[PDB]
Amino acid sequence: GPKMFSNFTNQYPLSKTLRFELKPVGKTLEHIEKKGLLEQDEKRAEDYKKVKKIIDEYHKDFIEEALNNVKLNGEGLEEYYELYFKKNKDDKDKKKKEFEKIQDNLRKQIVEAFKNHEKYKNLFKKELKETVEKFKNFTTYFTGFHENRKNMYSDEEKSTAIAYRLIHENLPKFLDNMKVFEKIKEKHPEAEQLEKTLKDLGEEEVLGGNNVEDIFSLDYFNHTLTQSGIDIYNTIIGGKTEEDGNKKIQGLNEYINLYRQKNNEKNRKLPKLKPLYKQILSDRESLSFIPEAFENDEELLEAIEEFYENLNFSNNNEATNVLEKLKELLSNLADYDLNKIYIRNDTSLTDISQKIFGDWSVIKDALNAHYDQKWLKKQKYFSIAELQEALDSYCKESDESKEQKENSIADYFKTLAQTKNETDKKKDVEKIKAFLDSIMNLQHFVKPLHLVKGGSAGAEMEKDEAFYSEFEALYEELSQVIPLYNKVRNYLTQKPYSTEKIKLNFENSTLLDGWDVNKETDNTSVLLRKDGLYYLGIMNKKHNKVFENIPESNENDKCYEKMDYKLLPGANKMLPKVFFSNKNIDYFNPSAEILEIYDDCHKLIDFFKESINKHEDWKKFGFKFSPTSSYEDISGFYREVEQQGYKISFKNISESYIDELVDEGKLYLFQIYNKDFKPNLHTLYWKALFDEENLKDVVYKLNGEAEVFYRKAYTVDKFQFHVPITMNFKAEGNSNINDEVNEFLKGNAPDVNIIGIDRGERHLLYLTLIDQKGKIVEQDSLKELKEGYLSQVVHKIAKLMVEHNAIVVMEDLNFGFKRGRFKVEKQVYQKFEKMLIDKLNYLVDKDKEPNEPGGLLNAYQLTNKFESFQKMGKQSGFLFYVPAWNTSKIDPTTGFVNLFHPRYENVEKAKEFFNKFDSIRYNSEKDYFEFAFDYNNFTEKAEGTKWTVCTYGERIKTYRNADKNNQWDSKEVNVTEEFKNLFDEYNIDYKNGNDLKEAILSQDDADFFKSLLHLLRLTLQMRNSITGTEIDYIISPVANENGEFFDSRKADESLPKDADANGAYHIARKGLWVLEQIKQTDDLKKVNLAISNKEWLEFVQER
Ligand SMILES: [Mg+2]
Ligand SMILES: [Mg+2]
C-alpha cells in the first residue's frame, strides 16, 4: 500500500516461539499416566537419588563422629562466652569487629577438624550396596554435588556452614536460654518436677550420666554439638514422648506456662524458650535443615510466636518493645538535626508525597526544579534539610499562598508512627496474615530512613549519633520479617504439582545422522497431520527405528500425513568436517595441499560446489547456487548452503498402523491445537510453515527443536508445546534500517504523517496523528488489565502506521524529566515500548494477500531489533524517541509556555518581580488585564519573545489537600473579577486605562502581593482540571494574532479537543522537527536527533 513501507519487507531474520496446547489422543493419556515420561531417565534419576542418599548418610555419620571429639578447651569458647554476652559490640565498632574476628577464628578451628578426619570420606569410591556397585553411570554432574557438600563443610559465613549454625545462630539462643535460666532458676523450689521426673526419664539412654543443670553449664557445649545433644536439649526443653507412649511429660515451657496463679502484672509476657536447631532433621532428609519451606504448620506457629515474643518482649532491660520504641524514636526526629539524616531517593519519595500533599509528584518535581537543574547529579541518598528546603519553595502549583508545612517530613513521620490508626498493638491464617501485613506496612513506611549497605555511590557523610546509632541497631530487629515473610510466601503457598520440561528434536532425514554429528539424540519426535489438525509424535528411545522400512501396507486405507524434515545446520562448521576433516577424506581427494588451511577461497567454493554433486542425499535439496566466481568471503557462500538446505516433504502413512502404534505404546501422540483450532497469528504462522506458497521460497522455517510442558503432580492434566520458528528465513542481513529509513524520509517527506504518544494524566496513553502542517487527523485511546490494554493500543498504533502513511514518535524515559502526574508507571511504559517494537519488527495483516507487501509472505519490518542502547536519538527504524517532557502545558496555536515561576517570598523579591513587566494595563473594551513583558528579563531566553498575557478568565483553582480544613475542592474562578476586587480593595484605580505598574510598585502590604502573585500564577495556569471528573481543558492566556484565545472546550477538531491531547499533539509536533532535520541534513550517517528544550522552544514559538 504505502510507498515507503513497501520497500521494508525483507530486512532481517526474526525468531519466535509458538505456544500451543496438546490434548492426548486415545491410549496416550493412560500410557503417560501409568508408565510416565521417558523411563530410562527416570530410572537414572532414581538411582542418582539413591546413591546421593547413601552419600548423605555417610557424610552425616562422619560429621557426627568428627564432632563427637571436639573439646571446648581447645576451641576457646570459655573466654568467648563473656565477650559474646558482654553486649558492648553495639557501643563501639572496634569491639564488634574484634568479636567478628574471634568468631571467624573459632569457625576456622571448628572446620579445620573436618576435612582430614575419618579418611577424608570415601565418596570417590562411591562415585565408581547393589545400587553403588553398578548403576546407570552416564557421567552425571556429581562434581557439583561434591563441591556443594565441600562448601557446606567450609566456613564461608553462609547458611551451609556448620560453624555458622553452631556459633552465629545456635550460640545466641544458648546464651538467651542461659540468661533466662539464671532468673527462673528458682521456678521449681520443691525440685520434684526438675529432677525426679526429668533427669531419670529423659536420660535413660545414657543411664542418667548427666543432670538437668549439666546441660545448663557453659563448659558442656560440646555435648549439645552432636545431633544427640540437640535431641536431648529439645526433649528437655519441650517434653518427650517417653517409652510409655502416653505420659507426655511436660517440658520447661509448659512448666513455666503454669504460672497463672500469679495473675499480677509481673507474671505474663513470658519469653518462650529457644530450642536448639538441628541439622539433617526432617521426615526423610533435610540437608542441614535450610528453613526455606518448613515442614508443617507447627514450625510456622513456633516461628510466628518466637518473633511475636522477640518484638513486644516484656519491657525488661530497658524498653525492649520495638513497636513503641521505634514510634517514639521517629517522633523524636524533629528535635534531632536534619542536616545529617538521610532519605532514600527510590520510589519511597512517592509514598511520602502522597501523604503530605496528596499529590504523588510534588516532591519529585520540587527536587528537579529548585535543588538542581545537567543530569541533576543523581545521587542515591538525599537529606532531610535539603528536602525541606526544596519543599519550602516548589512554585506552589495550586494551594494556599502560604502553606503551614512547618517540619513537613518530621510531621509526616511522627503522625504516621502513632496517629495513623492508633491500633499498632495487636493458628488461623487470617490473624497471621494480618499481623505479617501490618509489619510489612510498618517496615515499608520506615524503609526510606534506612541506609543501604555502606558507601553507596558516595554520600554517607558523617551522620548524627543520637538518632542514626539507635536507628541502625533498631531496624535489624524489625528487618527480620523480610526473610521470614518469604517463608510464609514459600510454605503456605505451594503447588501440589510440578512443571517438567522435555526437549524434542525433529528427526532430520539427511544422511547427517550417525555420520558426523550424533552428540545428543534427545527425544526424537515426528509431526503428523490428518485433516488439518497437526499432531506431535514423540517416540520412545527404545523404539527409535519404528518409522523405518514401513511399506504403507495396501492402498484404499485412510492415511495420516507425516512430515519428512530435511535440514542442513551450521554450513560453515559442518560442511568442511565431512569433506576434508574426517570421514575418509582420501575418497573425495581434494589434494591442493588441503587448500592450505581449511582466489583460494573461490577455488575452495568451487570444490565444494562440485563435491556436493557427488553426494546423493545432499543433491536432493536441488541446490541452485549463484554464478561461480561472484562470491564475497567464503562464509557468505556457506549461507546459501544453509539457506537452500532446509526442505519439508509430506508422505502418507496408514492410519491403522498409527492406531496400532499408539495402542502398543511406542508412540506418544498429542493433538496440537489452540483453543480456536478468531484466527490467531500463531495459528497463521503455524499453518504457513507447511504452506505450498511458502515452501517454494522459504519465509518461515521450523528450527528443529521443541519443548513440551506438562503439569506432573501419577496423573497429568495440562500440556503445552513450545515451537521456536524462524521468520524471514531467506532474508538479507540488512539490520539497522535507520540508514535507509532516513533516505526515504529525506526523499518523500511531504506525504509523511506523524503519530505522537504521550503518558496522560487522566488516560494512560494518548495518541494524536498530526499531518505535516500541524493539523490533527485522528485522536484516539480511552497481566490481564495492563497487558490487555497495551496489547490493544499497540494494535492501533501498528494500524494507523500503514493506513495513514505515518511514523511514530515516542518518549525517551532516561533522557528527560516529566513534570506531572503521568498515569503510566515506569515498569508499564518500559514494557509497552518493548511490545510496540516487537509488533513493528514483523507486522503482518491476515486480510492482505500472502504475497502483498504487507501479507503473510511479505511482512513489514519497520523497526530494528530491541537494543539496550541508550543514546540521544535512538531512532528505531520508523519509531523515533524524544526526551521526556511535560508538553501538556504548551499552547498549540502559538507555542506559549509559562516560564515565569512566580512564588510568594520576601516583599523585596515580590517588588522586584513586578518591575520587570513592561505594562500591567487593563483593557476595559474587552474587560481583561494585559500583562506586557519580555522573557529576557525573567530567564535566559532568546530575548525576542515579547508576549502579552491576557486574563481571559474562567479558570479552575484547587484549594488544598485534606478533607475539610484543607480541601481538594476545585472552584471555577473568574480571574478578571478577582483581579478587579483585589485592586479595588487596596485603593488602586484601573478604570481610566492607565498603567498599573507604578501603583503596584507603591503598595507595601505583604498580603496584597500574596494575592497578586497567586492571581498571576492562576492566569498562567493553562492545564486546569476538575478533580474526579472529566473536565480538563487548555485555556490560553496569550493572544492568537486575531484577538482569539485557545480553549479546548470550544476548539474544533483541527486543534486538540482535550487537555491530554495537547500533550500528545506536542510530542507528534516534535517529530516534525525531526523530519525537517532529516530533510535539511547532508550526512545521513552521523545526524543529530537530540531534542533540546532551547532549540525546540524556538521552533514552536516560529509557528
Ligand atoms: Mg509527556
Ligand atoms: Mg501530558
GROMACS .gro file of N, CA, C and O in nm, residues 283-357:
model
  300
  283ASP      N    1   1.155  -3.547   5.791
  283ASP     CA    2   1.088  -3.676   5.780
  283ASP      C    3   1.177  -3.777   5.709
  283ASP      O    4   1.189  -3.893   5.752
  284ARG      N    5   1.240  -3.736   5.599
  284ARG     CA    6   1.332  -3.821   5.525
  284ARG      C    7   1.475  -3.768   5.527
  284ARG      O    8   1.567  -3.841   5.566
  285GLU      N    9   1.496  -3.643   5.487
  285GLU     CA   10   1.628  -3.582   5.485
  285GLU      C   11   1.612  -3.432   5.470
  285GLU      O   12   1.528  -3.385   5.394
  286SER      N   13   1.694  -3.356   5.544
  286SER     CA   14   1.685  -3.211   5.545
  286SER      C   15   1.804  -3.141   5.480
  286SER      O   16   1.788  -3.029   5.431
  287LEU      N   17   1.922  -3.204   5.479
  287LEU     CA   18   2.043  -3.146   5.421
  287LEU      C   19   2.077  -3.012   5.488
  287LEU      O   20   2.073  -2.906   5.426
  288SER      N   21   2.108  -3.021   5.617
  288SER     CA   22   2.146  -2.911   5.706
  288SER      C   23   2.027  -2.828   5.751
  288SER      O   24   2.046  -2.725   5.818
  289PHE      N   25   1.904  -2.868   5.716
  289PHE     CA   26   1.782  -2.805   5.764
  289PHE      C   27   1.777  -2.657   5.728
  289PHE      O   28   1.775  -2.568   5.814
  290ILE      N   29   1.776  -2.630   5.598
  290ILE     CA   30   1.750  -2.495   5.549
  290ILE      C   31   1.600  -2.471   5.561
  290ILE      O   32   1.520  -2.543   5.501
  291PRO      N   33   1.557  -2.372   5.640
  291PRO     CA   34   1.414  -2.349   5.664
  291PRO      C   35   1.349  -2.262   5.557
  291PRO      O   36   1.278  -2.165   5.587
  292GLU      N   37   1.372  -2.296   5.430
  292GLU     CA   38   1.314  -2.220   5.320
  292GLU      C   39   1.168  -2.257   5.294
  292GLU      O   40   1.096  -2.179   5.231
  293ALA      N   41   1.124  -2.373   5.341
  293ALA     CA   42   0.986  -2.415   5.320
  293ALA      C   43   0.921  -2.477   5.444
  293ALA      O   44   0.803  -2.513   5.437
  294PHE      N   45   0.994  -2.491   5.555
  294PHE     CA   46   0.942  -2.551   5.678
  294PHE      C   47   0.893  -2.693   5.653
  294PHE      O   48   0.919  -2.751   5.547
  295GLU      N   49   0.826  -2.753   5.752
  295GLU     CA   50   0.767  -2.885   5.735
  295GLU      C   51   0.616  -2.884   5.748
  295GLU      O   52   0.547  -2.940   5.661
  296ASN      N   53   0.561  -2.822   5.852
  296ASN     CA   54   0.417  -2.822   5.874
  296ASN      C   55   0.379  -2.690   5.940
  296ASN      O   56   0.462  -2.600   5.957
  297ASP      N   57   0.251  -2.678   5.978
  297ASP     CA   58   0.204  -2.558   6.045
  297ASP      C   59   0.262  -2.542   6.184
  297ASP      O   60   0.262  -2.431   6.238
  298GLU      N   61   0.311  -2.651   6.244
  298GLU     CA   62   0.363  -2.644   6.380
  298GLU      C   63   0.488  -2.556   6.387
  298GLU      O   64   0.497  -2.466   6.472
  299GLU      N   65   0.584  -2.578   6.297
  299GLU     CA   66   0.704  -2.495   6.295
  299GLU      C   67   0.671  -2.351   6.259
  299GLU      O   68   0.733  -2.257   6.311
  300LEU      N   69   0.574  -2.331   6.169
  300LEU     CA   70   0.532  -2.196   6.135
  300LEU      C   71   0.476  -2.124   6.257
  300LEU      O   72   0.507  -2.006   6.280
  301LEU      N   73   0.394  -2.193   6.337
  301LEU     CA   74   0.343  -2.134   6.460
  301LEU      C   75   0.456  -2.104   6.557
  301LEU      O   76   0.456  -1.999   6.623
  302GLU      N   77   0.554  -2.195   6.569
  302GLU     CA   78   0.667  -2.169   6.658
  302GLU      C   79   0.742  -2.044   6.616
  302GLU      O   80   0.777  -1.960   6.700
  303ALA      N   81   0.769  -2.030   6.486
  303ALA     CA   82   0.842  -1.913   6.437
  303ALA      C   83   0.763  -1.785   6.458
  303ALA      O   84   0.818  -1.682   6.499
  304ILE      N   85   0.632  -1.789   6.431
  304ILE     CA   86   0.549  -1.670   6.448
  304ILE      C   87   0.546  -1.628   6.594
  304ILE      O   88   0.562  -1.510   6.627
  305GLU      N   89   0.526  -1.724   6.685
  305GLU     CA   90   0.525  -1.692   6.827
  305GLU      C   91   0.661  -1.643   6.875
  305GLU      O   92   0.669  -1.553   6.959
  306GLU      N   93   0.769  -1.702   6.822
  306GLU     CA   94   0.902  -1.657   6.859
  306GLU      C   95   0.925  -1.512   6.819
  306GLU      O   96   0.977  -1.433   6.898
  307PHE      N   97   0.886  -1.475   6.697
  307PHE     CA   98   0.905  -1.337   6.656
  307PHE      C   99   0.812  -1.244   6.733
  307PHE      O  100   0.850  -1.131   6.766
  308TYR      N  101   0.691  -1.290   6.764
  308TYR     CA  102   0.600  -1.208   6.843
  308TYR      C  103   0.657  -1.179   6.981
  308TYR      O  104   0.646  -1.067   7.032
  309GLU      N  105   0.720  -1.280   7.043
  309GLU     CA  106   0.785  -1.258   7.172
  309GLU      C  107   0.908  -1.169   7.157
  309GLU      O  108   0.936  -1.087   7.245
  310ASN      N  109   0.982  -1.184   7.047
  310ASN     CA  110   1.102  -1.104   7.027
  310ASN      C  111   1.070  -0.957   7.002
  310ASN      O  112   1.151  -0.870   7.033
  311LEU      N  113   0.953  -0.928   6.945
  311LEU     CA  114   0.918  -0.790   6.912
  311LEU      C  115   0.868  -0.714   7.034
  311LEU      O  116   0.927  -0.614   7.075
  312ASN      N  117   0.757  -0.761   7.093
  312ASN     CA  118   0.699  -0.690   7.206
  312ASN      C  119   0.781  -0.710   7.333
  312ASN      O  120   0.802  -0.615   7.408
  313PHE      N  121   0.827  -0.832   7.357
  313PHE     CA  122   0.910  -0.868   7.473
  313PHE      C  123   0.829  -0.835   7.599
  313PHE      O  124   0.706  -0.851   7.600
  314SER      N  125   0.894  -0.791   7.708
  314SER     CA  126   0.823  -0.764   7.832
  314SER      C  127   0.869  -0.634   7.898
  314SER      O  128   0.850  -0.617   8.019
  315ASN      N  129   0.928  -0.542   7.821
  315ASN     CA  130   0.977  -0.414   7.873
  315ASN      C  131   1.078  -0.435   7.985
  315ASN      O  132   1.084  -0.359   8.082
  316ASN      N  133   1.159  -0.540   7.972
  316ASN     CA  134   1.265  -0.570   8.067
  316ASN      C  135   1.401  -0.538   8.005
  316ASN      O  136   1.419  -0.550   7.883
  317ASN      N  137   1.495  -0.496   8.090
  317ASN     CA  138   1.626  -0.448   8.045
  317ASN      C  139   1.609  -0.334   7.944
  317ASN      O  140   1.644  -0.346   7.826
  318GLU      N  141   1.551  -0.225   7.993
  318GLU     CA  142   1.508  -0.110   7.912
  318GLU      C  143   1.391  -0.150   7.823
  318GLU      O  144   1.351  -0.267   7.821
  319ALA      N  145   1.335  -0.054   7.750
  319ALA     CA  146   1.216  -0.080   7.669
  319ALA      C  147   1.256  -0.166   7.549
  319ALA      O  148   1.308  -0.116   7.449
  320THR      N  149   1.231  -0.296   7.559
  320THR     CA  150   1.259  -0.389   7.451
  320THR      C  151   1.145  -0.399   7.350
  320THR      O  152   1.158  -0.469   7.250
  321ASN      N  153   1.034  -0.329   7.375
  321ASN     CA  154   0.921  -0.329   7.282
  321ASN      C  155   0.958  -0.245   7.161
  321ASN      O  156   0.958  -0.122   7.166
  322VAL      N  157   0.991  -0.312   7.051
  322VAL     CA  158   1.034  -0.242   6.930
  322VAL      C  159   0.921  -0.156   6.875
  322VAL      O  160   0.945  -0.046   6.822
  323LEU      N  161   0.797  -0.202   6.887
  323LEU     CA  162   0.684  -0.133   6.825
  323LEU      C  163   0.670   0.009   6.877
  323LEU      O  164   0.651   0.103   6.799
  324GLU      N  165   0.679   0.028   7.009
  324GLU     CA  166   0.667   0.161   7.066
  324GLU      C  167   0.799   0.237   7.068
  324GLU      O  168   0.799   0.360   7.058
  325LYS      N  169   0.911   0.166   7.080
  325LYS     CA  170   1.041   0.232   7.079
  325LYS      C  171   1.067   0.299   6.945
  325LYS      O  172   1.114   0.414   6.939
  326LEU      N  173   1.035   0.230   6.835
  326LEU     CA  174   1.053   0.289   6.703
  326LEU      C  175   0.960   0.408   6.683
  326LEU      O  176   1.000   0.509   6.624
  327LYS      N  177   0.837   0.398   6.732
  327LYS     CA  178   0.743   0.509   6.722
  327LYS      C  179   0.795   0.632   6.796
  327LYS      O  180   0.792   0.743   6.743
  328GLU      N  181   0.843   0.613   6.919
  328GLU     CA  182   0.897   0.725   6.995
  328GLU      C  183   1.021   0.783   6.928
  328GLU      O  184   1.038   0.905   6.923
  329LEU      N  185   1.109   0.696   6.877
  329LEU     CA  186   1.230   0.744   6.812
  329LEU      C  187   1.197   0.827   6.688
  329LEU      O  188   1.258   0.933   6.666
  330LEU      N  189   1.100   0.782   6.608
  330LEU     CA  190   1.060   0.860   6.491
  330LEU      C  191   0.992   0.990   6.532
  330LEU      O  192   1.011   1.093   6.467
  331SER      N  193   0.912   0.987   6.639
  331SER     CA  194   0.850   1.110   6.688
  331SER      C  195   0.953   1.207   6.745
  331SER      O  196   0.924   1.326   6.758
  332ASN      N  197   1.072   1.158   6.779
  332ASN     CA  198   1.181   1.243   6.827
  332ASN      C  199   1.266   1.300   6.714
  332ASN      O  200   1.367   1.364   6.740
  333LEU      N  201   1.226   1.277   6.588
  333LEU     CA  202   1.307   1.321   6.475
  333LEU      C  203   1.315   1.473   6.466
  333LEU      O  204   1.418   1.527   6.423
  334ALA      N  205   1.208   1.543   6.505
  334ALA     CA  206   1.206   1.688   6.491
  334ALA      C  207   1.317   1.754   6.573
  334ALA      O  208   1.382   1.848   6.526
  335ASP      N  209   1.339   1.706   6.696
  335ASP     CA  210   1.442   1.765   6.781
  335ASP      C  211   1.581   1.743   6.722
  335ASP      O  212   1.668   1.831   6.732
  336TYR      N  213   1.605   1.627   6.662
  336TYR     CA  214   1.735   1.597   6.605
  336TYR      C  215   1.763   1.687   6.485
  336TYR      O  216   1.671   1.735   6.418
  337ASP      N  217   1.891   1.710   6.458
  337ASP     CA  218   1.930   1.790   6.343
  337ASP      C  219   1.894   1.717   6.214
  337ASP      O  220   1.909   1.595   6.204
  338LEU      N  221   1.847   1.793   6.116
  338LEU     CA  222   1.803   1.737   5.989
  338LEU      C  223   1.908   1.747   5.879
  338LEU      O  224   1.882   1.704   5.766
  339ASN      N  225   2.025   1.802   5.909
  339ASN     CA  226   2.129   1.818   5.809
  339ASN      C  227   2.203   1.688   5.779
  339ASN      O  228   2.271   1.679   5.676
  340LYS      N  229   2.192   1.587   5.866
  340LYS     CA  230   2.268   1.464   5.851
  340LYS      C  231   2.182   1.339   5.837
  340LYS      O  232   2.235   1.234   5.799
  341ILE      N  233   2.053   1.346   5.867
  341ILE     CA  234   1.963   1.233   5.848
  341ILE      C  235   1.926   1.224   5.700
  341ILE      O  236   1.892   1.325   5.637
  342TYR      N  237   1.934   1.104   5.644
  342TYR     CA  238   1.922   1.084   5.501
  342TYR      C  239   1.792   1.012   5.466
  342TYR      O  240   1.733   0.942   5.548
  343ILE      N  241   1.748   1.032   5.341
  343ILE     CA  242   1.626   0.972   5.288
  343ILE      C  243   1.658   0.907   5.154
  343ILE      O  244   1.730   0.965   5.072
  344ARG      N  245   1.604   0.787   5.133
  344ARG     CA  246   1.623   0.717   5.006
  344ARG      C  247   1.558   0.792   4.891
  344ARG      O  248   1.450   0.850   4.906
  345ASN      N  249   1.623   0.791   4.775
  345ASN     CA  250   1.573   0.856   4.655
  345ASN      C  251   1.490   0.762   4.568
  345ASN      O  252   1.454   0.799   4.456
  346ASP      N  253   1.456   0.644   4.618
  346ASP     CA  254   1.381   0.546   4.541
  346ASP      C  255   1.233   0.583   4.541
  346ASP      O  256   1.194   0.693   4.580
  347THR      N  257   1.149   0.490   4.497
  347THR     CA  258   1.005   0.512   4.488
  347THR      C  259   0.942   0.552   4.621
  347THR      O  260   0.826   0.596   4.622
  348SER      N  261   1.014   0.537   4.733
  348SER     CA  262   0.960   0.577   4.863
  348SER      C  263   0.921   0.724   4.863
  348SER      O  264   0.822   0.762   4.928
  349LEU      N  265   0.996   0.808   4.791
  349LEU     CA  266   0.963   0.950   4.784
  349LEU      C  267   0.825   0.975   4.724
  349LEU      O  268   0.766   1.080   4.748
  350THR      N  269   0.773   0.880   4.645
  350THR     CA  270   0.635   0.890   4.600
  350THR      C  271   0.539   0.875   4.717
  350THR      O  272   0.447   0.957   4.734
  351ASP      N  273   0.559   0.773   4.801
  351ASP     CA  274   0.468   0.748   4.912
  351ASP      C  275   0.467   0.864   5.010
  351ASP      O  276   0.362   0.899   5.065
  352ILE      N  277   0.584   0.924   5.034
  352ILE     CA  278   0.589   1.043   5.118
  352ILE      C  279   0.511   1.157   5.054
  352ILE      O  280   0.442   1.234   5.123
  353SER      N  281   0.519   1.170   4.922
  353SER     CA  282   0.448   1.277   4.853
  353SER      C  283   0.298   1.260   4.864
  353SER      O  284   0.225   1.359   4.880
  354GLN      N  285   0.249   1.136   4.856
  354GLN     CA  286   0.105   1.112   4.856
  354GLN      C  287   0.041   1.143   4.990
  354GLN      O  288  -0.079   1.174   4.995
  355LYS      N  289   0.116   1.137   5.100
  355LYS     CA  290   0.059   1.162   5.231
  355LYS      C  291   0.063   1.309   5.269
  355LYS      O  292  -0.039   1.365   5.313
  356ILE      N  293   0.178   1.374   5.253
  356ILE     CA  294   0.192   1.513   5.295
  356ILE      C  295   0.105   1.604   5.210
  356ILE      O  296   0.032   1.690   5.261
  357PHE      N  297   0.110   1.587   5.077
  357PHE     CA  298   0.043   1.678   4.985
  357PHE      C  299  -0.077   1.618   4.913
  357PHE      O  300  -0.158   1.693   4.859
   0.00000   0.00000   0.00000
